[PDB]
Scaffold this active site. Sequence first.
Site, PDB file in Angstrom:
ATOM      1  N   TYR A 123       0.831  -1.200   0.000  1.00 10.54           N
ATOM      2  CA  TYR A 123       0.000   0.000   0.000  1.00 10.54           C
ATOM      3  C   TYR A 123       0.870   1.257   0.000  1.00 10.54           C
ATOM      4  O   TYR A 123       1.981   1.257   0.596  1.00 10.54           O
ATOM      5  CB  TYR A 123      -0.932   0.009   1.248  1.00 10.54           C
ATOM      6  CG  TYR A 123      -1.671  -1.305   1.325  1.00 10.54           C
ATOM      7  CD1 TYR A 123      -2.842  -1.483   0.591  1.00 10.54           C
ATOM      8  CD2 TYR A 123      -1.214  -2.369   2.123  1.00 10.54           C
ATOM      9  CE1 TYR A 123      -3.546  -2.705   0.629  1.00 10.54           C
ATOM     10  CE2 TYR A 123      -1.875  -3.615   2.156  1.00 10.54           C
ATOM     11  CZ  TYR A 123      -3.049  -3.783   1.406  1.00 10.54           C
ATOM     12  OH  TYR A 123      -3.654  -5.004   1.423  1.00 10.54           O
ATOM     13  N   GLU A 160      15.294   6.087  -5.030  1.00 11.09           N
ATOM     14  CA  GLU A 160      15.675   4.830  -5.699  1.00 11.09           C
ATOM     15  C   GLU A 160      16.824   4.205  -4.920  1.00 11.09           C
ATOM     16  O   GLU A 160      16.879   2.968  -4.772  1.00 11.09           O
ATOM     17  CB  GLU A 160      16.022   5.065  -7.190  1.00 11.09           C
ATOM     18  CG  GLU A 160      16.324   3.795  -7.972  1.00 11.09           C
ATOM     19  CD  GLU A 160      17.765   3.273  -7.828  1.00 11.09           C
ATOM     20  OE1 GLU A 160      18.627   3.982  -7.233  1.00 11.09           O
ATOM     21  OE2 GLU A 160      18.034   2.125  -8.335  1.00 11.09           O
ATOM     22  N   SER A 190       8.430 -35.056 -14.211  1.00 12.16           N
ATOM     23  CA  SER A 190       8.307 -34.867 -15.652  1.00 12.16           C
ATOM     24  C   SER A 190       8.195 -33.401 -16.014  1.00 12.16           C
ATOM     25  O   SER A 190       7.436 -32.657 -15.397  1.00 12.16           O
ATOM     26  CB  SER A 190       7.074 -35.568 -16.168  1.00 12.16           C
ATOM     27  OG  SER A 190       7.011 -35.382 -17.559  1.00 12.16           O
ATOM     28  N   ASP A 205      -4.940  -4.783 -27.244  1.00 12.09           N
ATOM     29  CA  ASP A 205      -5.122  -5.297 -25.857  1.00 12.09           C
ATOM     30  C   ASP A 205      -4.547  -6.683 -25.645  1.00 12.09           C
ATOM     31  O   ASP A 205      -3.990  -6.961 -24.580  1.00 12.09           O
ATOM     32  CB  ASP A 205      -6.598  -5.309 -25.476  1.00 12.09           C
ATOM     33  CG  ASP A 205      -7.172  -3.938 -25.188  1.00 12.09           C
ATOM     34  OD1 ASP A 205      -6.445  -2.900 -25.176  1.00 12.09           O
ATOM     35  OD2 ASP A 205      -8.399  -3.887 -24.895  1.00 12.09           O
ATOM     36  N   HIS A 208       5.938 -12.475 -11.421  1.00 14.21           N
ATOM     37  CA  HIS A 208       6.083 -12.891 -12.823  1.00 14.21           C
ATOM     38  C   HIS A 208       6.644 -14.322 -12.734  1.00 14.21           C
ATOM     39  O   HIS A 208       7.605 -14.574 -12.011  1.00 14.21           O
ATOM     40  CB  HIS A 208       7.129 -12.012 -13.467  1.00 14.21           C
ATOM     41  CG  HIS A 208       7.053 -11.987 -14.954  1.00 14.21           C
ATOM     42  ND1 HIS A 208       7.399 -13.081 -15.728  1.00 14.21           N
ATOM     43  CD2 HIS A 208       6.663 -11.010 -15.801  1.00 14.21           C
ATOM     44  CE1 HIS A 208       7.250 -12.753 -17.007  1.00 14.21           C
ATOM     45  NE2 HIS A 208       6.821 -11.505 -17.082  1.00 14.21           N
TER      46      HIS A 208
HETATM   47  O1  LIG Z   1      17.768  -1.258  -3.675  1.00 18.16           O
HETATM   48  C1  LIG Z   1      17.860  -1.635  -4.874  1.00 18.16           C
HETATM   49  O2  LIG Z   1      17.178  -2.559  -5.357  1.00 18.16           O
HETATM   50  C2  LIG Z   1      18.912  -0.994  -5.793  1.00 18.16           C
HETATM   51  C3  LIG Z   1      19.320   0.441  -5.425  1.00 18.16           C
HETATM   52  C4  LIG Z   1      20.632   0.885  -6.130  1.00 18.16           C
HETATM   53  N1  LIG Z   1      20.509   0.588  -7.538  1.00 18.16           N
HETATM   54  C5  LIG Z   1      21.628   0.802  -8.289  1.00 18.16           C
HETATM   55  O3  LIG Z   1      22.597   1.396  -7.770  1.00 18.16           O
HETATM   56  N2  LIG Z   1      21.587   0.354  -9.565  1.00 18.16           N
HETATM   57  C6  LIG Z   1      22.693   0.554 -10.512  1.00 18.16           C
HETATM   58  C7  LIG Z   1      23.526  -0.730 -10.304  1.00 18.16           C
HETATM   59  C8  LIG Z   1      24.743  -0.979 -11.212  1.00 18.16           C
HETATM   60  C9  LIG Z   1      25.439  -2.343 -10.956  1.00 18.16           C
HETATM   61  C10 LIG Z   1      24.681  -3.592 -11.421  1.00 18.16           C
HETATM   62  N3  LIG Z   1      24.233  -3.331 -12.787  1.00 18.16           N
HETATM   63  C11 LIG Z   1      23.261  -3.921 -13.476  1.00 18.16           C
HETATM   64  O4  LIG Z   1      22.621  -4.796 -12.881  1.00 18.16           O
HETATM   65  C12 LIG Z   1      22.840  -3.519 -14.886  1.00 18.16           C
HETATM   66  C13 LIG Z   1      22.289  -4.432 -15.804  1.00 18.16           C
HETATM   67  C14 LIG Z   1      21.871  -4.027 -17.093  1.00 18.16           C
HETATM   68  C15 LIG Z   1      21.924  -2.709 -17.551  1.00 18.16           C
HETATM   69  I1  LIG Z   1      21.251  -2.103 -19.509  1.00 18.16           I
HETATM   70  C16 LIG Z   1      22.450  -1.801 -16.618  1.00 18.16           C
HETATM   71  C17 LIG Z   1      22.899  -2.208 -15.338  1.00 18.16           C
HETATM   72  C18 LIG Z   1      22.160   0.541 -11.916  1.00 18.16           C
HETATM   73  O5  LIG Z   1      21.164  -0.204 -12.206  1.00 18.16           O
HETATM   74  O6  LIG Z   1      22.695   1.307 -12.739  1.00 18.16           O
HETATM   75  C19 LIG Z   1      21.734  -0.059  -5.658  1.00 18.16           C
HETATM   76  O7  LIG Z   1      22.124  -1.076  -6.350  1.00 18.16           O
HETATM   77  O8  LIG Z   1      22.357   0.203  -4.587  1.00 18.16           O
HETATM   78 CA   LIG Z   2       4.220   0.829   0.438  1.00 20.29          CA
HETATM   79 ZN   LIG Z   3      20.732   4.917 -10.038  1.00 14.72          ZN
HETATM   80 ZN   LIG Z   4      22.712   3.942  -7.591  1.00 17.45          ZN
END
Ligand SMILES: O=C(O)CC[C@H](NC(=O)N[C@@H](CCCCNC(=O)c1ccc(I)cc1)C(=O)O)C(=O)O
Ligand SMILES: [Ca+2]
Ligand SMILES: [Zn+2]
Ligand SMILES: [Zn+2]
EC number: 3.4.17.21
Lengths: 694, 694
Positions: B218, B370, B574, B610, B633
């Site tokens: 929520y 984020e 299977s 759709d 998913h």
């Molecule tokens: O709390 C969360 O779920 C993530 C928050 C925060 N998210 C990120 O920093 N994401 C960054 C992480 C970069 C390192 C891992 N990269 C990937 O998985 C990736 C895969 C495909 C592509 I096109 C671009 C990036 C991003 O996606 O650019 C974190 O990782 O600390």
């Molecule tokens: Ca929430």
């Molecule tokens: Zn980011």
């Molecule tokens: Zn980040």
Amino acid sequence: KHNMKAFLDELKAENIKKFLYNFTQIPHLAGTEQNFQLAKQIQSQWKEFGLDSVELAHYDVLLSYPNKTHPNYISIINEDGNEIFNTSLFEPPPPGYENVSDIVPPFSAFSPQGMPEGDLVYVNYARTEDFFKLERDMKINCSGKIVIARYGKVFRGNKVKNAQLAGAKGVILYSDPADYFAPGVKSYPDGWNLPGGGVQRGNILNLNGAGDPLTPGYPANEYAYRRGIAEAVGLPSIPVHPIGYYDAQKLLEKMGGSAPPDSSWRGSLKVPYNVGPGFTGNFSTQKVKMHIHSTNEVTRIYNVIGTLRGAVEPDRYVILGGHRDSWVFGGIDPQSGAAVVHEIVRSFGTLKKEGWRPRRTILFASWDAEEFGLLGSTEWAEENSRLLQERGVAYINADSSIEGNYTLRVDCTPLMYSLVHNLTKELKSPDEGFEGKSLYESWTKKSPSPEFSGMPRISKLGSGNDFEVFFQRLGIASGRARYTKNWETNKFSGYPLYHSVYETYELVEKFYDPMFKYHLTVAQVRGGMVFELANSIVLPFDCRDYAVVLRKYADKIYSISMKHPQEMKTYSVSFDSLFSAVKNFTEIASKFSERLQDFSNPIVLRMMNDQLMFLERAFIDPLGLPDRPFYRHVIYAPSSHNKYAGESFPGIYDALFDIESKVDPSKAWGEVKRQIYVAAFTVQAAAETLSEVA
Amino acid sequence: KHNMKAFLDELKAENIKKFLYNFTQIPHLAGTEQNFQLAKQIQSQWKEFGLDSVELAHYDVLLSYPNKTHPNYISIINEDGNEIFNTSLFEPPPPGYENVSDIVPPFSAFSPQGMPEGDLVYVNYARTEDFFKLERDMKINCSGKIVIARYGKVFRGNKVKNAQLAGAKGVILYSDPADYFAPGVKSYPDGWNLPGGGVQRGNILNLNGAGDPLTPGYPANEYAYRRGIAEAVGLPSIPVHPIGYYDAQKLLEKMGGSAPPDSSWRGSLKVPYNVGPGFTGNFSTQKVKMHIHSTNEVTRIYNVIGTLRGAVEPDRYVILGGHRDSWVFGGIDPQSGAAVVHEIVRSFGTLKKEGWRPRRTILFASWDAEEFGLLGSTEWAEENSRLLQERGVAYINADSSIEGNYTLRVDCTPLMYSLVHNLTKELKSPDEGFEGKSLYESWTKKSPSPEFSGMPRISKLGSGNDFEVFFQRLGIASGRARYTKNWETNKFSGYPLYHSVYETYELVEKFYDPMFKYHLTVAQVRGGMVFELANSIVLPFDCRDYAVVLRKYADKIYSISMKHPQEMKTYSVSFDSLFSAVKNFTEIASKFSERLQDFSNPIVLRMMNDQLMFLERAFIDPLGLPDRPFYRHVIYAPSSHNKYAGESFPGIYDALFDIESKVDPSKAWGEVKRQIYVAAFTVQAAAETLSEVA
Ligand SMILES: O=C(O)CC[C@H](NC(=O)N[C@@H](CCCCNC(=O)c1ccc(I)cc1)C(=O)O)C(=O)O
Ligand SMILES: [Ca+2]
Ligand SMILES: [Zn+2]
Ligand SMILES: [Zn+2]
Ligand SMILES: *[C@@H]1O[C@H](CO)[C@@H](O[C@@H]2O[C@H](CO)[C@@H](O[C@@H]3O[C@H](CO)[C@@H](O)[C@H](O[C@H]4O[C@H](CO)[C@@H](O)[C@H](O)[C@@H]4O)[C@@H]3O)[C@H](O)[C@H]2NC(C)=O)[C@H](O)[C@H]1NC(C)=O
Ligand SMILES: *[C@@H]1O[C@H](CO)[C@@H](O[C@@H]2O[C@H](CO)[C@@H](O[C@@H]3O[C@H](CO)[C@@H](O)[C@H](O[C@H]4O[C@H](CO)[C@@H](O)[C@H](O)[C@@H]4O)[C@@H]3O)[C@H](O)[C@H]2NC(C)=O)[C@H](O)[C@H]1NC(C)=O
Ligand SMILES: *[C@@H]1O[C@H](CO)[C@@H](O[C@@H]2O[C@H](CO)[C@@H](O[C@@H]3O[C@H](CO)[C@@H](O)[C@H](O)[C@@H]3O)[C@H](O)[C@H]2NC(C)=O)[C@H](O)[C@H]1NC(C)=O
Ligand SMILES: *[C@@H]1O[C@H](CO)[C@@H](O[C@@H]2O[C@H](CO)[C@@H](O[C@@H]3O[C@H](CO)[C@@H](O)[C@H](O)[C@@H]3O)[C@H](O)[C@H]2NC(C)=O)[C@H](O)[C@H]1NC(C)=O
Ligand SMILES: O=C(O)CC[C@H](NC(=O)N[C@@H](CCCCNC(=O)c1ccc(I)cc1)C(=O)O)C(=O)O
Ligand SMILES: *[C@@H]1O[C@H](CO)[C@@H](O[C@@H]2O[C@H](CO)[C@@H](O)[C@H](O)[C@H]2NC(C)=O)[C@H](O)[C@H]1NC(C)=O
Ligand SMILES: *[C@@H]1O[C@H](CO)[C@@H](O[C@@H]2O[C@H](CO)[C@@H](O)[C@H](O)[C@H]2NC(C)=O)[C@H](O)[C@H]1NC(C)=O
Ligand SMILES: *[C@@H]1O[C@H](CO)[C@@H](O[C@@H]2O[C@H](CO)[C@@H](O)[C@H](O)[C@H]2NC(C)=O)[C@H](O)[C@H]1NC(C)=O
Ligand SMILES: *[C@@H]1O[C@H](CO)[C@@H](O[C@@H]2O[C@H](CO)[C@@H](O)[C@H](O)[C@H]2NC(C)=O)[C@H](O)[C@H]1NC(C)=O
Ligand SMILES: *[C@@H]1O[C@H](CO)[C@@H](O)[C@H](O)[C@H]1NC(C)=O
Ligand SMILES: *[C@@H]1O[C@H](CO)[C@@H](O)[C@H](O)[C@H]1NC(C)=O
Ligand SMILES: *[C@@H]1O[C@H](CO)[C@@H](O)[C@H](O)[C@H]1NC(C)=O
Ligand SMILES: *[C@@H]1O[C@H](CO)[C@@H](O)[C@H](O)[C@H]1NC(C)=O
Ligand SMILES: *[C@@H]1O[C@H](CO)[C@@H](O)[C@H](O)[C@H]1NC(C)=O
Ligand SMILES: *[C@@H]1O[C@H](CO)[C@@H](O)[C@H](O)[C@H]1NC(C)=O
Ligand SMILES: [Ca+2]
Ligand SMILES: [Cl-]
Ligand SMILES: [Cl-]
Ligand SMILES: [Zn+2]
Ligand SMILES: [Zn+2]
């Protein structure tokens, strides 16, 4: 012209009569060959009537049957273990049947096996409040006792749940003449009352929407993984068996211990209705012993699914469904409904053969295994859930068309209130004394709304029939309608011959509807609803009617909470967010209604048809209600104390219920507050689906 | 003409550069005033650029911050409790900043407070297999130890989960030059490598899709009921803190006990990489002590939501979203993405001012928080879930536009494979040596598909960014694209200055993309995708591409199971139903494609639009995956061992993982069979949404 009048005029009382006779000559118990043969007959006829396709959808589900060579019965047993009285092994068959075979004897479907023996306690209707009275006020302990309870008031599965939680080791259900014998009318075959040897069959599951006990969430198809019996959903843990009032008199006459606490505990038999435990002085050493040997078995069931493809919006489905399986002959339940559906299909097929097609697709269903827990409809909906939730406009149920001959009874979503009022104003009343008057006029006269002058009563949907999965799980606008009696305290009890061998064609033809005029009226209401839903350019739903009831339900749940003003102060329990949401819903719904009246543009229309279709869908919470994951509608759920009855704002209702008894009030009122948040949020989110889209 | 070429030509490298500079002068940490001011600036500019409405959606969510007057740090402590070495209290600020205030010091967001002291164990990357090696092969027990782990390979929250389950009492994360220092390039400010004082911030939650820890299911709106901290989702139970490699060298140099088991455990520092526990002989009595004082606090966050209403299908939404909050200056993460989105909005607004409108509505989002667990996007999607699931066409993410300057990187649903191939064939390659060649040609050359000759690599979506709620919870077709490096083993580790103070405008302008040509290319890919999704008459999805990958994933999971042939025999495991479903999906998808090519009828079109929109939606199971209710998913989920990586047939994958170690094989293989049934059923049900509707 091919309009609604053409459709309605094609329906014939005489055809409904012929179909009823045809459907009620032999038993059609779910999972038996006779019921498969009837499925094949209906499939063939619906093809002949003109539907585009008609298929059988089958599933392998858990059913329950007595053991033919090891009969269920109950005894009074003496000190030595001599069985000095035995309940009956079958109901006396009605005249001219007596040589029908395969009449299933009375039993409680899904009872476990066992031979418990003990002392009786009489628990009235075995309602939550009956057990509260026993345990809290009278200090009678049901633990290790066999309870005896009269049918009526609430679904029998709730009785058994309540007896289990009270520690009972067996349950005996019986039909009291107070509830199943109308004064002044004769027993079957000479009238419509229950004879003393008559017994009401019925399942005693607590499925809460799950469908087949072994496959919750997924259809019971050929490759399904099944739970083990120990992890099955909804099965009772103690033996249960139903009896007639001749037998019940024998078990109750010797009852001792405490007197009944008041007159609302006394039925009509010539016994004291003592609560027990156990028998009076002289018989104190006799016990009651049950012998239950029924078995649960995975068995194939068959739904018939007919399609009439829509001319313009073939990917929008209006569904008319009712079940086909019966306990025995099903003279009222379900064949009085199935015959009406058969005649509706015939009339629609007539129009189709002359070149007409409805605007939207209509699906027709003859469900199987309704009597064993809504199994056929639920498994089919589990299989087709993605099609139904993105395409399903409405579901109209069609079980028993008659349970009396007095007036109409309707339960439906508020979205259909205006449709029902409008349709019934255009139909003729079949009632004596209302010749030339509308059904709306007779119905409003005989069943006035408790809120509004000049309007008829329409009730909330509960459960206990095949619309449950469509409405409470999937959020598809649903409705049901039938002819009923004038017997308000018997609202949930069933007509006297309910689920007995005596529910036959002759019952209906002689005593309920010899002219088949009430059947015809019901065919016009159900069929008329389907016609309007499948043909109206703008879907015939009025969102403003939901806004009116949401305010009524908010006032009601607030009033319940306000029984506890000190706790609402201590824990800062505010309903402000819920009233705010209801206010917003009312305002947005009013503006949407203005736009709906103010727009040649098929995209705007369908956009707005989709807003109307998805409005019921918006009240669905994908997380479900607490411990009831398949009851997902936030506004309505089957009552936790009585599956048949609908409850409004059920999450908040159950959080408030008996709250003064909870050991940790901080935690209990925290959960009330959580449920108010969920309800306020869901109402506002539903409102927002009616705002301008961008 | 107002076509895609008009849109694409309006995008300017020089504008992206100006916006990047503007967005990266001060820190924009979630929940701070500076980040609210930037939200208001973007809202104002998107209005000026021409959007129809631009609003701020706010929520009050759990965030985490160090205590400004009680700094986090780690010590080596001696026998007497003298702290003889202390880790740094901040990263040396880069040139010309040094007087910027409000740079948050390195910390692990959501760490609990504590001052645990104990002996170190070195756990390599703290992956599931690293702990298997430690416990099963080396018989080293982490219980009551402080573990030290290098960043890289997997999401840091999985490291912490793994350390917790191994019984660790604290975790120290550090950046090894093996993973964060590319050979031959200089440390910031003279190149793009991580200095020894640099440290990677980041949250260590295990939310599994829940969003705000206090309000799973929520939106965290003004009247929300919040869980108590003890019942919050995803919070770690042991203190955690990150350090740079100068500090790590000091903690690791004295390490004793067992040698590293093999070279894959050794980083690039001049230390033995002994596993421990504890220090070598002379220092055996010294311990490591953490001091963590960060606090979790409910804090307001702000999403900017812009709308460009569609001319024809305003109730169909194509969403371009990326976050705005950064750890510090966000030079790459996220402002290189946010600047691209800003320029896309500007170009769309340009066309709009000349009288154009897209066919469908486009929504533009600047998400908040984020970095603290995808909080802004998730809470917004929770609030608007009913609108998104009935109206959402696609979601294109837009975080960092560059993490290298080598070639394109794309992850998306199979439904978008054809769209990506077609669009990239029409775009110019920005690469040296591919002047006058298409992006498709350079990308395919530099990143060849491992399956198909003459096609580029496109990976499965995992998680770790704002598309998660749209794709894995709601089943909205999603994609992402950026420019990347050539460093395959660093796929999930981040670029060297990831989440450090050194990620600045200057980093990008000097070392990554001085001409802003890679940014421009990415703006053309993301913007081009949004344009086609929002404007193509028939949605640009190819269901046949899903059929191809479903077969690949079925072969793969079957191969995993077939490592255990004796158990598949014993328990009759299977995969036939799953291959049957995939075969059916392939056949029906082929026929649907034929009809889609073979139909002036807007109802048939939209009916078929759709079917295309709801196809990703059909892979959603409302019951979720086991113990992960917000990953719904059935084909894709974030890997249970590494949130960043996607896993296919995740329910069956996790039921098979390490199955040879389960104590009750009957039960374990029963669950594999259950997951095969769920997957086969979901694939067949998705197939059926593509059949003729009636
Ligand atoms: O709390 C969360 O779920 C993530 C928050 C925060 N998210 C990120 O920093 N994401 C960054 C992480 C970069 C390192 C891992 N990269 C990937 O998985 C990736 C895969 C495909 C592509 I096109 C671009 C990036 C991003 O996606 O650019 C974190 O990782 O600390
Ligand atoms: Ca929430
Ligand atoms: Zn980011
Ligand atoms: Zn980040
Ligand atoms: C019914 O619809 C109405 C819209 O017509 C909708 O009204 C909204 O109410 C919310 C909460 O009641 C308002 O939220 C406020 O938003 C402003 C920014 O616009 C904030 O500054 C406010 O926060 C301050 O004040 C709070 C309350 O005292 C403090 O708790 C807080 O710490 C802040 O100091 C506050 O969040 C929102 O602006 C309106 N939107 C309008 C008027 O358009 C109402 O919520 C709907 N009902 C439901 C149940 O959704
Ligand atoms: C892929 O699509 C195909 C349709 O092209 C679909 O085929 C269906 O397969 C099911 C099960 O495999 C078939 O089910 C059979 O139905 C008949 C009645 O039509 C029954 O008599 C069968 O039951 C008998 O045989 C069983 C197997 O030996 C016994 O276990 C059982 O006790 C009975 O004696 C059986 O249920 C179904 O008819 C076809 N439908 C067709 C061919 O149109 C297939 O299921 C799809 N794949 C998936 C994963 O959905
Ligand atoms: C049940 O029947 C009632 C009565 O016929 C229906 O309500 C009526 O519906 C029509 C069509 O929307 C309304 O007509 C409109 O009036 C406004 C002027 O105010 C005009 O702008 C429109 O162009 C159109 O003429 C009419 O006002 C309305 N009557 C009332 C009292 O509400 C109702 O829709 C029916 N319910 C259904 C079909 O579910
Ligand atoms: C990516 O680009 C390819 C190549 O242009 C697109 O595939 C092509 O799409 C067109 C339109 O559907 C197809 O044309 C059709 O051909 C058949 C004859 O076989 C005819 O019946 C139709 O009236 C129409 O002319 C074309 O065959 C097809 N080419 C191939 C090789 O598949 C594809 O749709 C694009 N992908 C998108 C937009 O997602
Ligand atoms: O397992 C289940 O959920 C129900 C299976 C089976 N269902 C029924 O027998 N349903 C019968 C029950 C009649 C008694 C209670 N009646 C109602 O609740 C009711 C309410 C409104 C209307 I219009 C019509 C009937 C029916 O709906 O006609 C049963 O009750 O044993
Ligand atoms: C119910 O009506 C059906 C259909 O009229 C009857 O079934 C038909 O019976 C005739 C004569 O035996 C057969 O030739 C047909 O093959 C049957 N049609 C079907 C099944 O579609 C059935 O006999 C009637 N049942 C009763 C009890 O009267
Ligand atoms: C109630 O039924 C039981 C069970 O059939 C009867 O008890 C059986 O009677 C026969 C013949 O007398 C004995 O061989 C069995 O051993 C008895 N079985 C038992 C006690 O389980 C009993 O006679 C019946 N009682 C009445 C009053 O009809
Ligand atoms: C980023 O650009 C914005 C918009 O150009 C700048 O904000 C404007 O600054 C001028 C001059 O101070 C003000 O008169 C306007 O009110 C601002 N417009 C807004 C906020 O919409 C902002 O100064 C720039 N930031 C940096 C660091 O250069
Ligand atoms: C590491 O930091 C700690 C904490 O600030 C330092 O220990 C403190 O030193 C002051 C002055 O010597 C004492 O008054 C405090 O009581 C100490 N606090 C402790 C032990 O918690 C320590 O000197 C620092 N070590 C190094 C090598 O710089
Ligand atoms: C029914 O009872 C008979 C006779 O006592 C027994 O042989 C058989 O096992 C039972 N059938 C079942 C359990 O289905
Ligand atoms: C009810 O009776 C049983 C007797 O065995 C006992 O275990 C149970 O505690 C009793 N309940 C109470 C609290 O009276
Ligand atoms: C039919 O209607 C009459 C007249 O009110 C009533 O007396 C009779 O009992 C009704 N039949 C049934 C079954 O209700
Ligand atoms: C931060 O530490 C200071 C100084 O020791 C203390 O007074 C304050 O409570 C802390 N702030 C928090 C817990 O937010
Ligand atoms: C790991 O170490 C701790 C020491 O306290 C102990 O409790 C735990 O059982 C050990 N695990 C095993 C089985 O080696
Ligand atoms: C940019 O490209 C050049 C040429 O390959 C490379 O040497 C340089 O390191 C790249 N910059 C980054 C940050 O990858
Ligand atoms: Ca099922
Ligand atoms: Cl009904
Ligand atoms: Cl991204
Ligand atoms: Zn029925
Ligand atoms: Zn019934």
